Design a protein around this ligand. Structure first.
Ligand SMILES: CCCCCCCCCCCCCCCCCC(=O)OC[C@H](CO[C@@H]1O[C@H](CO[C@H]2O[C@H](CO)[C@H](O)[C@H](O)[C@H]2O)[C@H](O)[C@H](O)[C@H]1O)OC(=O)CCCCCCCCCCCCCCCCC
Ligand code: CLA
Ligand code: CLA
Ligand code: CLA
Ligand code: CLA
Ligand SMILES: CCCCCCCCCCCCCCCCCC(=O)OC[C@H](CO[C@@H]1O[C@H](CO)[C@H](O)[C@H](O)[C@H]1O)OC(=O)CCCCCCCCCCCCCCCCC
Ligand SMILES: CCCCCCCCCCCCCCCC(=O)OC[C@H](CO[C@@H]1O[C@H](CS(=O)(=O)O)[C@@H](O)[C@H](O)[C@H]1O)OC(=O)CCCCCCCCCCCCCCC
Ligand SMILES: CCCCCCCCCCCCCCCC(=O)OC[C@H](COP(=O)(O)OC[C@@H](O)CO)OC(=O)CCCCCCCCCCCCCCC
Ligand SMILES: CC1=C(/C=C/C(C)=C/C=C/C(C)=C/C=C/C=C(C)/C=C/C=C(C)/C=C/C2=C(C)CCCC2(C)C)C(C)(C)CCC1
Ligand SMILES: CC1=C(/C=C/C(C)=C/C=C/C(C)=C/C=C/C=C(C)/C=C/C=C(C)/C=C/C2=C(C)CCCC2(C)C)C(C)(C)CCC1
Ligand SMILES: CCCCCCCCCCCCO[C@@H]1O[C@H](CO)[C@@H](O[C@H]2O[C@H](CO)[C@@H](O)[C@H](O)[C@H]2O)[C@H](O)[C@H]1O
Ligand SMILES: CCCCCCCS[C@@H]1O[C@H](CO)[C@@H](O)[C@H](O)[C@H]1O
Ligand SMILES: CCCCCCCS[C@@H]1O[C@H](CO)[C@@H](O)[C@H](O)[C@H]1O
Ligand SMILES: [Ca+2]
Ligand SMILES: [Cl-]
Ligand SMILES: [Mg+2]
Lengths: 341, 172, 37, 38, 65, 34, 39, 30, 504, 30, 34, 81
């Protein structure tokens, strides 16, 4: 019972907001990431990095504000406030995109903090740490997309910027340049997210529709007691219903809930692997056989070749404003366009 | 189209012609499926984390549940203690019925709005258009991320169905 | 030789067989296009 | 002072009205001044 | 269990299972080293990153010919 | 019977103080003209 | 030679040490004051 | 900069006011 | 029974069979190295280190043999293009053989340790239970690692007793294996300074030895023993997995950005050298020095090494590939044969025009020609009806200097356009696309494939660390929670300190 | 061969549906 | 079409090896004493 | 419960509102003035509507040099006369 143990005592007091040892990492970093995002989207420009307005102060709305990435010329600079670029000047630092690295890094450490929180509370309460384990998928997504992906590319500039419309742009850029929808790792991601949503929906609805009458109310929520020992719905009825409707059904509850962990977590991990590939332009961009056939045969057309034409449009029409450091000047005559449009 | 790449074709042309990404019903749809995925993993992990010990370490914990047993297979008070401490107490569900109702309602309602988003862009009520919305003192256009989106959409528009249009407006 | 006390039987029930085959077959259905390229 | 003196429902109503007011102001801003396209 | 010549030789190196030093022991010292290690990594990172720029240290292919 | 200045109190105000300041700012912004 | 960025590194290092130091000083102090009661 | 005082006069007037009003209970607590 | 995903847990309390399984894994890895080297030797073409080096041919382990000084074949060639060299036993073939033999011996050892698992050495002398003194084992193994690290730096890399390491000039033209002296000043932490790799292994070696002796002689503090569960071998699994994914992220990073240990003659150039036009800048510098010395344009460009020109070409950029575009770079654009020479474009007015180069981001790119101020002067138009800048209208010609087309000039629009098209990729080369049935689509180099594999594996091992760390710290409940868990432990306010029953 | 492969994998999956449904291990109440 | 010639054996082994793994485990499970 | 006063109690208490009917408007007005005085622009280096371009300029002041970026931005600002 020395100072370390007294401190441990205090950190782990059962209060409205639990602190813990992990709280020392988590709360300042989460607070600075959130605060940085709000500061930037409220007051800070992207004129000098992107040639964009991005704050409420400039006239942007909730959908169009962002904390934007730094200029491509900054490369992968940590862009520390006391670093060689800003040199301690807060204003310049904002103008150079310092808030972007500020938010990404404090955010990363805050996520570490939060997952440590999950381990700590699980250990304290006496449960298995499957919540933290599940949270590894958010970590993988954030690290692959905001750290690994730009680190593979020329600079932080091509990371996602922190804003609604900015993220939409990130999506469209990935379609046009990476053909990301074609990527089997993204497809597995989609299957995991849509399948997760499906399981959420179907499990919630099934439980709610195989409830035992445990009260007299027509509103049935009150007919539950957290301390009760009995299942509140019928697994046997649920099992017969889905067996006769869909052909197969869960019969094991433990398996059911593990599966609910497994599907979306695995989905997100796969999507992460794909983005790690896109960091190096290691894309699933083309099917070589498709291209050999289409090059030789001007009547051969599939939805795959149709979509590449769309991609080529996206690249040529978005690049000069989206990539201002490149100083693209694409004369009218070279812009790809179909008839009339 | 009834196919994988055809589905992507549909999505890209949809973005060109409706700016679906900037449509709040599609955004509610994304909250619906991202949220559904989130709560799927969350629920799964909480229940799995509070499974009552019924097995040895050399066997699957799944064998600790038997089909049609009347007893609940996990300790919901323990799971609630955990999650309630993870955030704060009153952010967590102590009522299983309430919780499972949430689990059903969030993705279902979100996806209802996704469907309605497609179904109303069906009559060309489109996503928010903030093209050239910010203007400086002289009148120069100051681009926002919305305008960059607009450039991408333009690439899609001008390239799609490249031999099908004879007149300057794509009106359906 | 004296028998090793650390041996354990292994199991795969039928449902796990079906799930596993589904995963393998669907992964193959997904990845095969890319293997043919 | 003692808790419960002001009816929670009045607090909720007033707070809510304030939220509607400020959000209403922001949507007004969408059509006037900066961001209005005009 | 079976004894062997080599086994007999190595026996002492695997005989102190579970043996600990009382309390916190050399944890403080360990902490110091960890601290130093952190700063070390911070340096090499920042050198590689061009956040820390030192005389005679040109972080480029053009470092030495 | 109850304390006033708690961990909860701090947390709450670290969020709420800047939120009201910021909302004041954004309000002001609604009357900025090019 | 101490370049501007080496100086900046010392400033960052120092600032971090100050933040962590003050943080743990305050935490340990408050823990010392408001002890958990055991029987 | 006069603007920082014109802007952070409300904040410090608020802090001072609430300190004034909560001082006895704060002293009682401490 | 054990579920399929737990079959290997039977090793947790059986040190002998664990060592056997580790021997078998090690056999398999060494056997992979041997097999891989043999396959690469059966497919590697040594005849042209200039335009057909190992990184153009999908060589993955050959550059690692080269990096530490294995550069010769028993058949008489070397990777630097020498002939009539005697490499001794330690040729590529020798290294492969050694690995195969090692694999065999490890296999046999594995059988022995599997059969004779019940050695007394693995038993706690007090309890008779299987037990491994992990803290002391760590001391011993760290001491050994320290010794080996130190000897690798002090003898191998220095050339004191060993070959040294691969070093080159800043443009990867004259690489070779050399002894490298350690660098003890700050430049030692410059990733492009090899002297730093040497100094590293010497100093970290010594530190490993000292720390090793520490960990052999001093027991763990009780509080750390308990906190990290040092009686449980899975804790070592977790922290080892953590150290390993750290190391994997690092080698991915140094492979992608380049360093003294990822030389471009062994792995190919980096994407950043294309981004910054590194090679083009050096080429222009040389040509200008030539002209200023009084050389003609033809002479100046003919003085440019084909190897240097070949670096200034986007087909060697590791950021131009595809996930399922498989094989060597030669399978894409072809086996490079020769530099065609530098293309100079001019309009009818005789102004020099410059083709705008393709950025790595773009699978396809337009053909635009500007003057020295970036003013657009010609292009290849999409829509023709309102073209102003067509090569026909602007009278664009192309003259070549150096290379195979040296002194030649082309004026027919199709030919000029063809060359402009190639100019968006940088310097222009003739390729043999027939030998390999090349399909004309860019593939990545070993720099790219290595970087991808290792960043991915690193990311997955993060999950490994998480999982096994969890298994370690929550061992007591990983079969379920206490069936008699008191509601008061998880209720709010019953205990002052969460999970502490003594704080009621 | 490609087409044969695609259709073959699909066919195996459909057969798998059949066995998973009609030849499942029956759920048994305890 | 000019497909990759290794695609067939790749797909075939990708399916067969793990499938066979599972079938082996399943069958030896069934044959264990009930 | 965890020892803190119920929020229901606090926010429906007279004293709470005596305090916050001062402190909340004070903060709101502070932020308001942070914008209206123009201090926000100067603290964060955000262009006013008349400071995105000089009068006849139409080129974005994009930062193109990492280590002299600060000086670049400063030059850009001087270019607004
Ligand atoms: C999972 C669980 C974890 C939970 C989350 C944890 C969050 C922790 C946060 C860590 C932050 C890491 C910052 C990395 C910054 C960086 O990398 O900064 C990059 C620098 C390299 O600098 C870059 O270098 C490039 C190449 O330059 C070289 O080449 C040039 C052109 O030829 C010139 O010659 C030049 O002088 C020469 O330096 C360009 O100059 C770029 O502009 C410049 O940014 O490397 C460096 O600092 C160090 C590089 C070596 C170590 C990198 C290890 C970490 C990264 C692993 C992933 C790498 C991605 C691989 C792609 C897949
Ligand atoms: C634990 C919480 C936490 C964590 C993990 C971080 C982490 C970070 N901060 Mg944040 N920050 C925090 C709290 C935290 N911060 C708080 C509370 C504030 C308010 C003051 C800030 C305000 C802030 C600003 C303004 C900035 C950061 C930045 C950063 C990043 C760079 C920091 C750095 O290089 O430190 C280096 C220092 C250390 C790692 C300290 C280690 C000290 C060792 C272990 C002991 C030895 C010290 C020695 C005795 C001192 C000798 C000095 C002598 C030589 C002169 C890093 C991601 C920068 C950034 O994000 O740039 C984009 C940045 O500009 N932070
Ligand atoms: C018996 C000695 C021996 C020798 C002299 C070699 C030599 C070689 N091996 Mg072989 N190999 C061996 C045994 C050996 N091997 C064994 C037992 C295996 C099975 C595991 C292999 C499996 C293998 C593979 C798969 C490959 C080789 C390859 C090679 C070649 C490249 C070496 C290299 O780049 O390593 C690089 C080594 C490192 C970067 C070491 C990293 C050390 C980490 C960072 C230490 C971390 C822990 C440590 C305790 C930290 C504390 C240290 C302390 C001092 C502070 C080289 C000819 C390569 C090759 O060319 O194949 C043909 C190759 O791909 N080897
Ligand atoms: C560190 C790993 C590694 C790396 C970076 C390389 C790199 C290289 N290899 Mg080598 N090789 C390796 C290990 C590696 N190899 C191993 C282990 C073997 C034994 C099989 C070989 C045998 C080998 C041969 C025979 C050849 C190469 C060749 C090459 C070159 C071409 C690479 C290529 O086309 O990849 C293509 C990469 C892919 C197509 C990526 C595949 C991604 C997988 C399929 C995804 C799996 C998804 C998974 C199932 C999802 C599960 C989800 C679930 C969890 C729910 C390149 C330099 C070629 C060469 O040029 O030789 C001169 C060549 O002919 N390698
Ligand atoms: C040093 C590396 C290492 C080692 C020695 C172990 C060891 C173990 N793991 Mg861990 N693990 C690791 C890394 C490691 N893991 C990594 C990187 C991950 C994330 C992918 C995991 C995720 C993980 C989970 C989720 C689980 C384990 C479990 C286990 C235990 C039982 C494993 C078993 O029986 O599999 C049996 C496996 C098979 C019969 C076949 C697996 C086939 C794989 C999926 C595809 C083929 C892989 C290929 C052959 C390998 C290529 C080499 C690779 C380097 C590329 C065992 C102690 C289990 C456990 O804890 O039980 C109590 C468990 O549930 N591990
Ligand atoms: C007391 C409790 C304190 C709680 C603190 C909480 C801290 C975190 C809160 C984050 C809020 C983020 C949204 C801010 C939006 C904003 O300020 O818009 C500010 C803008 C200001 O409006 C803009 O102002 C400009 C001024 O130059 C121009 O006039 C523009 O034309 C005009 O659009 O308001 C709007 O855009 C109107 C719509 C606002 C809708 C908000 C988003 C709703 C959905 C949010 C989902 C995310 C989850 C939030 C959950 C909480
Ligand atoms: C940006 C720079 C950052 C650098 C770091 C500087 C700050 C360090 C981090 C500090 C984070 C937490 C500070 C607030 C802690 C607190 O409010 O404790 C409240 C304590 C005890 O209150 C007591 O609080 C108890 C309830 S509880 O502990 O709050 O849950 C209650 O039991 C008791 O009766 C009551 O009197 O009172 C104090 O003395 C606060 C000291 C000043 C802070
Ligand atoms: C009353 C408002 C209804 C709103 C639309 C419907 C919401 C619920 C539908 C979900 C179906 C899930 C599948 C079956 C799931 C299922 O079986 O439900 C079961 C659950 C419990 O049923 P009970 O029988 O106990 O009660 C329902 C009746 O019998 C009356 O007591 O139903 C409800 O909770 C009713 C909720 C009414 C109030 C709901 C309002 C929620 C939405 C509010 C609006 C949000 C819009 C946000 C946009 C930004
Ligand atoms: C960055 C930085 C920092 C920090 C700062 C901070 C931390 C800040 C914070 C800040 C904050 C913290 C802010 C806040 C704000 C808020 C707001 C602005 C809000 C708004 C709201 C709204 C608008 C609402 C809306 C809604 C919703 C959401 C739903 C319901 C309905 C409605 C519509 C109402 C420092 C100094 C360290 C350093 C430098 C850098
Ligand atoms: C006995 C003996 C012997 C012999 C030996 C030998 C002959 C060996 C061999 C060995 C070998 C020959 C080995 C091999 C191995 C291999 C391996 C181990 C591999 C693996 C692989 C993998 C694992 C892969 C995977 C994958 C795929 C498939 C796809 C992509 C992705 C990845 C990469 C993942 C001698 C006479 C010497 C002496 C002594 C006795
Ligand atoms: C080309 C790809 C092919 C992939 C091939 C993969 C090979 C997989 C090998 C699986 C090994 C099976 O391991 C097998 O386990 C069973 C139990 O599970 C053991 O069986 C043991 O347990 C059972 C049940 O108590 C007893 O009835 C039996 O008498 C006893 O010997 C076998 O002794 C062992 O041989
Ligand atoms: C970080 C862990 C540092 C523990 S430090 C530890 O603290 C005790 C008092 O609390 C002292 O009695 C003991 O001598 C000291 O080693
Ligand atoms: C009318 C065109 C005459 C000029 C020849 C084209 C430019 S160069 C040409 O390009 C091919 C790649 O496309 C190479 O395979 C080939 O080696 C090379 O000669
Ligand atoms: Ca005006
Ligand atoms: Cl038409
Ligand atoms: Mg407005």
């Amino acid at each position: 019972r020395g100072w370390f143990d007294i401190l441990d005592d205090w950190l782990k007091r059962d209060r409205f907001v639990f602190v813990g040892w992990s709280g020392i990492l988590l709360f300042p970093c989460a607070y600075l990431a959130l605060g940085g995002w709000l500061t930037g989207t409220t007051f800070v420009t992207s004129w000098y990095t992107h040639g964009l307005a991005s704050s409420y102060l400039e006239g942007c709305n909730f959908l169009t504000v962002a904390v934007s990435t730094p200029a491509n010329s900054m490369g992968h600079s940590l862009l520390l406030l006391w670093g060689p670029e800003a040199q301690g000047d807060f204003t310049r630092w904002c103008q150079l995109g310092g808030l972007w690295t500020f938010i990404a890094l404090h955010g990363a450490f805050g996520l570490i903090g939060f997952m440590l929180r999950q381990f700590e509370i699980a250990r304290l309460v006496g449960v298995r740490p499957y919540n933290a384990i599940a949270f590894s998928a958010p970590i993988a997504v954030f690290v692959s997309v905001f750290l690994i992906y730009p680190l593979g590319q020329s600079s932080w500039f091509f990371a996602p910027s922190f804003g609604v419309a900015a993220i939409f742009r990130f999506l469209l850029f990935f379609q046009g340049f990476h053909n990301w929808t074609l990527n089997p790792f993204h497809m597995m991601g989609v299957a995991g997210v849509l399948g997760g949503a499906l399981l959420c929906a179907i499990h919630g609805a099934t439980v709610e529709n195989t409830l035992f009458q445990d009260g007299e109310g027509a509103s049935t929520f009150r007919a539950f007691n957290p301390t009760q020992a009995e299942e509140t719905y019928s697994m046997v009825t649920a099992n017969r219903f889905w067996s006769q409707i869909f052909g197969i059904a869960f019969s094991n509850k433990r398996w059911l809930h593990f599966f609910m962990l497994f599907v979306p977590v695995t989905g997100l991990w796969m999507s992460a692997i794909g983005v790690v590939g896109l960091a190096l332009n290691l894309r699933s961009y083309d099917f070589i056989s498709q291209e050999i056939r289409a090059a030789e045969d001007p009547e051969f057309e599939t939805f795959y070749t149709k979509n590449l034409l769309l991609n080529e449009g996206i690249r040529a029409w978005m690049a000069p404003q989206d990539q201002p450091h490149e100083n693209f000047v694409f004369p009218e005559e070279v812009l790809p366009r179909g008839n009339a449009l | 189209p009834l196919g994988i790449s055809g589905t992507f074709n549909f999505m890209i042309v949809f973005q060109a012609e409706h700016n679906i990404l900037m449509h709040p019903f599609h955004q509610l749809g994304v909250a619906g499926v991202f949220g559904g995925a989130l709560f799927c993993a969350m629920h799964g992990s909480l229940v799995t984390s509070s499974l009552i010990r019924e097995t040895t370490e050399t066997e699957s914990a799944n064998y600790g549940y038997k089909f049609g047993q009347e007893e609940e297979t996990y300790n919901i008070v323990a799971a609630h203690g955990y999650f309630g401490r993870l955030i704060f107490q009153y952010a967590s569900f102590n009522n299983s019925r309430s919780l499972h109702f949430f689990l059903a309602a969030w993705p279902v309602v979100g996806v209802w709005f996704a469907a309605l988003g497609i179904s109303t862009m069906a009559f060309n009520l489109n996503g928010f258009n903030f093209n050239h919305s910010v203007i400086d003192a002289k009148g120069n256009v100051i681009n926002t991320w919305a305008d960059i989106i607009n450039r991408a959409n333009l690439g899609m528009e001008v390239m799609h169905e490249r031999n099908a249009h004879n007149f300057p407006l794509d009106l359906a | 030789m004296e028998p090793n006390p650390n041996r354990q039987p292994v199991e795969l029930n039928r449902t796990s067989l079906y799930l596993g085959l589904l995963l393998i077959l669907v992964l193959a259905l997904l990845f095969s296009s890319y293997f043919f390229n | 002072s003692e808790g419960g003196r002001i009816p929670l429902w009045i607090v909720a109503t007033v707070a809510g009205m304030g939220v509607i007011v400020i959000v209403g102001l922001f949507f007004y801003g969408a059509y006037a001044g900066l961001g209005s396209s005009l | 269990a079976r004894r062997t010549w080599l086994g007999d030789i190595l026996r002492p190196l695997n005989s102190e299972y579970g043996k600990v030093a009382p309390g916190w022991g050399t944890t403080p010292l360990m902490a110091v080293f960890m601290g130093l290690f952190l700063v070390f990594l911070l340096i090499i990172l920042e050198i590689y990153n061009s956040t820390l720029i030192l005389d005679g240290v040109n972080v480029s292919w053009k470092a030495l010919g | 019977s109850y304390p006033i200045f708690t961990v909860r109190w701090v947390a709450v105000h670290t969020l709420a103080v800047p939120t009201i300041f910021f909302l004041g700012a954004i309000a002001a912004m609604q009357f900025i003209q090019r | 030679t101490i370049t501007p960025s080496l100086k900046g590194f010392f400033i960052g290092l120092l600032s971090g040490a100050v933040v962590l130091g003050l943080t743990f000083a305050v935490l340990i102090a408050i823990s010392q004051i408001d002890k958990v009661q055991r029987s | 900069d006069w603007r920082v005082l014109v802007v952070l006069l409300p904040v410090l007037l608020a802090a001072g006011w609430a300190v004034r009003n909560i001082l006895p209970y704060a002293v009682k607590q401490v | 029974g054990l579920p399929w995903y737990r079959v290997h847990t039977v090793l947790i309390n059986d040190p002998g069979r664990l060592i056997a399984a580790h021997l078998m894994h090690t056999a398999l890895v060494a056997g992979w190295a041997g097999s891989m080297a043999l396959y690469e030797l059966a497919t590697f073409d040594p005849s042209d280190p200039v335009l057909n080096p190992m990184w153009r041919q999908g060589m993955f382990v050959l550059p690692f043999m080269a990096r530490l000084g294995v550069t010769g074949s028993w058949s008489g060639w070397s990777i630097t293009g020498e002939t009539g060299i005697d490499p001794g036993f330690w040729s590529f073939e020798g290294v492969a053989l050694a690995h195969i033999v090692l694999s065999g011996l490890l296999f046999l050892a594995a059988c022995w340790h599997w059969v004779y698992w019940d050695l007394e050495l693995f038993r706690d002398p007090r309890t008779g239970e299987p037990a491994l003194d992990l803290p002391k084992m760590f001391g011993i193994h760290l001491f050994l690692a320290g010794l080996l690290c130190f000897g690798f730096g002090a003898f191998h890399l220095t050339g004191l007793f060993g070959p040294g390491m691969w070093v080159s000039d800043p443009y990867g033209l004259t690489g070779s294996v050399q002894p490298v002296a350690p660098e003890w000043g700050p430049d030692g932490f410059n990733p492009y300074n090899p002297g730093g790799v040497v100094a590293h292994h010497i100093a970290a070696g010594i530190v490993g030895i000292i720390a090793g002796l520490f960990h052999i002689l001093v027991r763990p503090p009780q509080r750390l023993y308990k906190a990290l569960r040092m009686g449980n071998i899975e804790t070592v699994l977790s922290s080892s997995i953590a150290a390993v994914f750290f190391a994997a992220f690092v080698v991915a990073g140094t492979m992608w950005y380049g360093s003294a240990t990822t030389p471009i003659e062994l792995f190919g150039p980096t994407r950043y050298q294309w981004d910054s036009s590194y090679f083009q800048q050096e080429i222009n510098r040389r040509v200008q020095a030539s002209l200023a010395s009084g050389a003609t344009l033809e002479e100046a460009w003919s003085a440019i090494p084909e190897k240097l020109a070949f670096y200034d070409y986007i087909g060697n950029n590791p950021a131009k590939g595809g996930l399922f575009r498989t094989g060597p770079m030669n399978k894409g654009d072809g086996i490079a044969q020769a530099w065609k020479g530098h293309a100079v474009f001019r309009n009818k007015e005789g102004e020099e025009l410059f083709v705008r180069r393709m950025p790595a981001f773009f699978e396809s790119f337009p053909v635009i020609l500007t003057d020295k101020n970036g003013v657009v002067k010609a292009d290849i138009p999409f829509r023709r009806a309102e073209s102003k800048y067509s090569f026909e209208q602007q009278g664009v010609t192309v003259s070549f200097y150096g290379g195979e087309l040296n002194g030649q000039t082309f004026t027919d629009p199709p030919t000029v356009k063809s060359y402009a098209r190639k100019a968006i990729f940088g310097e222009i080369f003739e390729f043999d696309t027939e030998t390999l049935n090349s399909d004309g689509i860019f593939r990545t180099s070993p720099r790219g494939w290595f970087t991808f594999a290792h960043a991915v594996f690193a990311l997955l091992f993060f999950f490994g660390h998480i999982w096994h760390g969890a298994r370690t710290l929550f061992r007591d409940v990983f079969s379920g929670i206490d069936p008699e868990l008191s509601p008061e432990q998880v209720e709010w306010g019953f205990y002052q300190k969460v999970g502490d029953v003594t704080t009621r | 061969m490609e087409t044969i492969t695609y259709v073959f994998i699909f066919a195996c999956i459909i057969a798998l549906f059949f066995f998973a449904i009609f030849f499942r291990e029956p759920p048994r109440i305890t | 079409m000019e497909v990759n010639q290794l695609g067939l054996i790749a797909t075939a082994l990708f399916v067969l090896v793990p499938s066979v793994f599972l079938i082996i485990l399943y069958v030896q499970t069934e044959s264990q004493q009930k | 419960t965890t020892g803190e006063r119920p929020f229901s109690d606090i926010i429906t208490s007279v004293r709470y509102w005596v305090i916050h009917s001062i402190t909340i408007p004070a903060l709101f007005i502070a932020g308001w003035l942070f914008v209206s005085t123009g201090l926000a622009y100067d603290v964060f280096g955000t262009p006013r509507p008349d400071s995105y371009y000089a009068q006849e300029q139409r080129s974005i002041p994009l930062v193109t040099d990492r280590f002299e970026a600060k000086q670049q931005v400063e030059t850009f600002l001087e270019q607004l006369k």
